[PDB]
């Protein structure tokens, strides 16, 4: 059950990057992925391993066979690399399946989820790989419209897991995005430009995914706060639009979704509510039942689908567009906290003083 981040060593490790790494660890991230092209970097890797060892974080290094040798390392003499703080290698160029099998008893081995064949997997068996140390990593997709689909992904992952492997996947970040396109580094195209927190949490719930990594350099403070809030409290933190409603304060705060969860709505399980505004209820609409609903007066709901106008249901505010992909994550019995737009960062700050 791993969350991870990416670090880009094509640039010098800034203080912002170190600050980031340390904060992500405190937010429940235990892993680092980094991809190296070396046409120096050896000292950069020595600096990063130091951060990771101290911070108790793993490092998977994606590197070509030649870039590894031209980094003064060799795949057959791994003690130095392990000494550095590297816990895994994903080789793509120039290493045999056989070398990889042998290396799996010493270090985690990254495979390419999309290209690994049943034959190569059978060869790793034949060479007595430690399959408990084999990680099948999906790729990420800088170019919009080129990420993989849910079906293929699900299909692939089931197969991978059936073969005994671990499944690792990326979500994009929304702080500092990687160039040259700056459109995020998702694995799944449906995550393109989406809330990374909602993307990560949803993927992690999938029974065939073992780990989720931020593909881009950083996530925004807002998104960090959502991870942090969920990690410390098990609550989903979402923002709502400003409203003039008299019932706004009743709906701000923590709610628990009923354990017998409705198809259409989230239902908050816990004087007179007068008729106020009773407008259409598009997805994300926060509502309170008024006095016309009799014994249901005061029930608080958030719509999961577009619902029509109802005279008996006051419409109070709406979940912020960006947080609406969190809504399907909120299952039977899950808690969620509604805060007013722009305050997610200070709301998470408050938790920690
Ligand atoms: Cl899809
Ligand atoms: Na999972």
XYZ file of C-alpha atoms and ligand atoms in Angstrom:
355
model
C 0.000 0.000 0.000
C 2.444 2.666 -1.276
C 2.196 6.308 -2.304
C 5.176 7.840 -4.115
C 6.677 10.941 -5.752
C 8.966 11.639 -8.716
C 12.194 13.578 -8.648
C 13.962 14.906 -11.756
C 17.744 14.790 -11.538
C 18.230 16.550 -14.895
C 18.469 19.629 -12.699
C 20.296 20.417 -9.410
C 18.293 19.384 -6.308
C 16.794 22.688 -5.081
C 15.814 23.469 -1.480
C 12.212 23.541 -2.661
C 12.677 19.952 -3.835
C 14.126 18.844 -0.472
C 11.334 20.722 1.413
C 8.871 18.935 -0.877
C 10.349 15.449 -0.377
C 10.314 15.826 3.425
C 6.726 17.144 3.458
C 5.523 14.348 1.165
C 7.000 11.757 3.534
C 5.081 13.344 6.463
C 1.971 13.215 4.260
C 2.221 9.410 3.854
C 4.494 9.075 0.757
C 7.225 6.402 1.186
C 8.705 6.161 -2.286
C 10.630 8.017 -4.941
C 10.813 7.334 -8.680
C 13.489 8.958 -10.818
C 14.391 8.557 -14.492
C 17.987 9.253 -15.504
C 19.477 10.203 -18.892
C 23.255 10.857 -18.801
C 24.677 11.714 -22.258
C 27.559 15.418 -12.734
C 24.662 13.095 -12.058
C 26.550 10.612 -9.847
C 26.816 13.291 -7.116
C 23.140 14.217 -7.647
C 22.179 10.568 -6.999
C 24.489 10.490 -3.952
C 22.616 13.658 -2.633
C 19.162 12.122 -3.295
C 19.965 8.721 -1.691
C 21.083 10.684 1.371
C 17.729 12.430 1.570
C 15.877 9.099 1.060
C 17.922 7.078 3.573
C 17.354 9.762 6.261
C 13.722 10.090 5.347
C 13.194 6.263 5.096
C 12.023 6.291 1.526
C 12.618 3.988 -1.375
C 14.166 4.967 -4.704
C 13.399 3.229 -7.959
C 15.817 4.405 -10.651
C 14.777 4.110 -14.282
C 18.012 4.147 -16.276
C 19.417 2.673 -19.482
C 22.162 0.018 -19.322
C 24.669 2.485 -20.855
C 23.733 5.443 -18.645
C 24.337 3.168 -15.613
C 27.842 2.177 -16.763
C 28.564 5.785 -17.784
C 27.619 6.693 -14.199
C 30.482 4.590 -12.821
C 28.143 1.882 -11.612
C 27.787 -1.668 -12.916
C 24.736 -3.924 -12.682
C 26.851 -6.855 -11.426
C 28.397 -4.861 -8.552
C 25.434 -3.339 -6.710
C 26.785 -2.857 -3.142
C 27.815 0.772 -3.779
C 24.368 1.607 -5.277
C 22.635 -0.014 -2.325
C 25.025 1.876 -0.017
C 23.886 5.077 -1.824
C 20.187 4.569 -0.898
C 18.906 3.137 -4.165
C 16.381 0.335 -3.598
C 15.390 -0.489 -7.159
C 16.445 -0.461 -10.779
C 14.251 -0.330 -13.868
C 16.489 -1.263 -16.779
C 15.250 -0.858 -20.285
C 18.339 -0.904 -22.360
C 21.077 -3.525 -22.276
C 20.390 -5.827 -19.312
C 19.325 -9.455 -19.711
C 16.332 -11.089 -18.021
C 18.930 -13.358 -16.411
C 20.889 -10.467 -14.878
C 17.586 -9.092 -13.671
C 16.560 -12.348 -11.998
C 19.897 -12.551 -10.151
C 19.613 -8.915 -9.157
C 16.087 -9.399 -7.751
C 17.444 -11.146 -4.637
C 19.466 -7.996 -3.810
C 17.360 -5.138 -5.111
C 13.864 -4.435 -6.395
C 13.563 -4.773 -10.155
C 11.376 -2.442 -12.217
C 9.643 -3.957 -15.233
C 7.717 -2.157 -17.936
C 4.027 -3.053 -17.365
C 3.146 -2.545 -21.063
C 5.938 -4.540 -22.739
C 6.596 -7.394 -20.335
C 5.715 -10.630 -22.146
C 4.595 -14.005 -20.770
C 7.916 -15.340 -22.147
C 10.122 -12.890 -20.256
C 8.102 -13.606 -17.090
C 8.629 -17.325 -17.744
C 12.384 -16.670 -18.142
C 12.553 -14.841 -14.803
C 10.866 -17.903 -13.248
C 13.440 -20.146 -14.925
C 16.183 -18.014 -13.406
C 14.589 -18.047 -9.949
C 13.773 -14.385 -9.650
C 12.422 -13.176 -6.339
C 8.924 -12.330 -7.691
C 8.225 -10.538 -4.395
C 10.812 -8.018 -5.585
C 9.537 -7.488 -9.116
C 7.621 -4.265 -9.749
C 5.736 -3.809 -12.992
C 5.660 -0.032 -13.602
C 3.307 1.625 -16.024
C 4.526 4.507 -18.058
C 3.357 8.116 -18.026
C 2.213 10.170 -20.972
C 3.374 13.777 -21.538
C 1.403 14.191 -24.760
C -2.350 14.819 -24.232
C -4.594 12.055 -25.660
C -1.978 9.298 -25.448
C -2.642 7.854 -21.930
C -4.026 4.362 -21.555
C -7.678 3.432 -21.050
C -9.263 1.913 -17.942
C -10.151 -1.395 -19.642
C -6.667 -2.136 -21.005
C -5.203 -0.990 -17.683
C -7.543 -3.254 -15.678
C -6.958 -6.092 -18.111
C -3.181 -5.695 -17.900
C -3.061 -5.351 -14.124
C -5.161 -8.476 -13.459
C -2.810 -10.452 -15.699
C 0.254 -8.907 -14.028
C -1.059 -9.747 -10.551
C -2.061 -13.247 -11.719
C 1.604 -13.651 -12.695
C 2.693 -12.730 -9.126
C 3.905 -9.155 -9.841
C 3.415 -5.802 -8.092
C 1.602 -3.077 -10.100
C 2.811 0.532 -9.935
C 1.126 3.435 -11.713
C 1.406 7.212 -11.993
C -0.963 10.106 -11.532
C -0.139 13.613 -12.775
C 0.845 16.445 -10.435
C -0.643 19.953 -10.407
C 2.097 22.067 -8.771
C 5.226 22.131 -10.959
C 4.457 20.199 -14.134
C 7.207 18.647 -16.281
C 8.022 20.281 -19.626
C 8.081 20.592 -22.555
C 4.262 20.168 -22.836
C 3.242 20.924 -19.183
C 0.044 18.917 -19.529
C 0.820 16.566 -16.596
C 2.252 13.023 -16.512
C -0.667 10.717 -16.033
C -0.771 7.016 -16.759
C -4.533 6.984 -17.458
C -5.814 9.557 -19.911
C -8.985 10.093 -17.818
C -6.711 11.665 -15.193
C -5.493 14.363 -17.572
C -5.861 17.729 -15.861
C -7.731 16.088 -12.943
C -7.320 16.441 -9.127
C -4.262 14.275 -8.360
C -5.570 13.460 -4.864
C -8.815 12.032 -6.225
C -6.866 10.191 -8.941
C -4.403 8.624 -6.454
C -6.952 7.610 -3.878
C -9.207 6.025 -6.541
C -6.323 4.066 -8.044
C -5.131 2.891 -4.655
C -8.613 1.473 -3.947
C -8.329 -0.673 -7.072
C -7.625 -4.272 -5.955
C -5.057 -4.675 -8.760
C -2.895 -1.582 -8.131
C -0.269 -1.764 -5.412
C 1.235 1.722 -5.618
C 0.543 5.205 -6.931
C 3.204 7.832 -7.757
C 2.982 11.504 -8.647
C 4.460 11.718 -12.166
C 5.187 15.462 -12.249
C 7.776 17.290 -10.029
C 5.255 18.482 -7.394
C 1.600 18.756 -6.469
C 0.090 22.080 -5.354
C -0.227 23.058 -1.670
C -4.000 22.558 -2.003
C -3.560 19.005 -3.194
C -0.940 18.280 -0.499
C -3.512 19.462 2.081
C -6.079 17.021 0.695
C -3.588 14.117 0.943
C -2.592 15.280 4.395
C -6.143 15.686 5.635
C -7.092 12.218 4.360
C -3.936 10.648 5.733
C -4.341 12.072 9.268
C -8.122 11.893 9.653
C -9.495 9.462 7.028
C -11.697 12.353 5.859
C -12.151 13.641 2.337
C -11.702 17.397 2.270
C -13.668 19.353 -0.345
C -14.432 23.026 -1.103
C -17.807 24.596 -1.848
C -18.729 27.783 -3.704
C -19.528 30.944 -1.684
C -23.222 31.231 -0.752
C -25.504 33.707 0.939
C -27.636 30.885 2.272
C -28.824 30.998 5.909
C -27.996 27.277 5.961
C -24.385 27.499 4.851
C -22.988 27.070 8.399
C -25.104 23.992 8.978
C -23.503 22.337 6.018
C -19.881 23.427 6.515
C -17.936 20.857 8.611
C -17.688 17.051 8.807
C -20.391 14.670 7.602
C -20.577 10.882 7.527
C -22.113 9.184 4.512
C -24.770 6.654 5.577
C -23.622 3.057 5.489
C -26.538 2.220 3.214
C -25.302 4.540 0.515
C -27.763 6.065 -1.950
C -27.234 5.787 -5.704
C -28.066 9.447 -6.331
C -26.768 11.376 -3.308
C -24.393 11.412 -0.403
C -26.514 11.508 2.778
C -25.293 13.151 5.965
C -26.397 10.778 8.637
C -26.960 13.442 11.333
C -34.451 24.556 14.266
C -37.145 24.757 11.534
C -35.609 24.762 8.021
C -37.685 27.260 6.056
C -38.137 27.152 2.300
C -35.289 29.224 0.751
C -33.996 28.557 -2.792
C -35.091 25.260 -4.324
C -33.308 25.162 -7.702
C -32.079 22.352 -9.980
C -29.443 20.124 -8.316
C -26.595 19.405 -10.771
C -23.851 17.013 -9.680
C -22.126 18.368 -6.551
C -25.092 20.370 -5.272
C -25.259 20.619 -1.469
C -28.828 20.602 -0.200
C -30.853 20.634 2.993
C -34.400 19.283 3.234
C -36.811 22.045 4.291
C -39.968 21.900 6.468
C -42.058 20.767 3.453
C -40.252 17.416 3.586
C -41.828 16.741 6.982
C -39.814 14.214 8.979
C -36.946 14.536 6.473
C -36.515 18.260 7.251
C -32.826 18.975 7.862
C -31.356 16.011 5.958
C -28.186 17.175 4.238
C -27.263 15.729 0.871
C -24.687 16.195 -1.833
C -25.832 15.098 -5.299
C -23.821 12.433 -7.106
C -25.828 12.888 -10.321
C -27.926 15.736 -11.863
C -31.219 15.918 -9.972
C -34.159 18.110 -10.861
C -35.641 21.018 -8.795
C -37.653 19.951 -5.700
C -39.741 22.537 -3.695
C -38.971 20.547 -0.535
C -35.157 20.671 -0.893
C -33.166 23.919 -0.363
C -30.104 24.293 -2.564
C -27.287 25.789 -0.485
C -24.078 25.645 -2.461
C -22.106 23.377 -4.802
C -18.839 21.406 -4.595
C -16.022 23.174 -6.459
C -15.549 21.809 -9.992
C -12.022 20.637 -9.155
C -13.186 18.594 -6.141
C -16.047 16.817 -7.845
C -13.944 13.763 -8.785
C -13.621 13.105 -5.020
C -17.397 12.486 -4.777
C -17.433 8.912 -6.211
C -14.619 8.096 -3.731
C -16.951 8.756 -0.830
C -18.391 5.349 -0.077
C -20.836 3.936 2.465
C -19.709 5.164 5.902
C -16.943 7.481 4.633
C -16.455 10.932 6.194
C -16.115 14.172 4.314
C -15.517 17.753 5.401
C -16.884 20.745 3.457
C -14.935 23.969 3.663
C -15.413 27.255 1.900
C -13.546 27.934 -1.355
C -9.848 28.832 -1.027
C -9.409 27.633 2.590
C -8.215 24.034 2.135
C -4.591 25.064 2.829
C -5.307 26.804 6.159
C -7.792 24.143 7.144
C -4.971 21.554 6.906
C -2.581 23.975 8.689
C -5.055 24.199 11.563
C -4.819 20.476 12.188
C -1.087 20.824 12.958
C -1.108 24.207 14.812
Cl -11.113 5.485 -19.524
Na -5.050 -1.273 -4.448
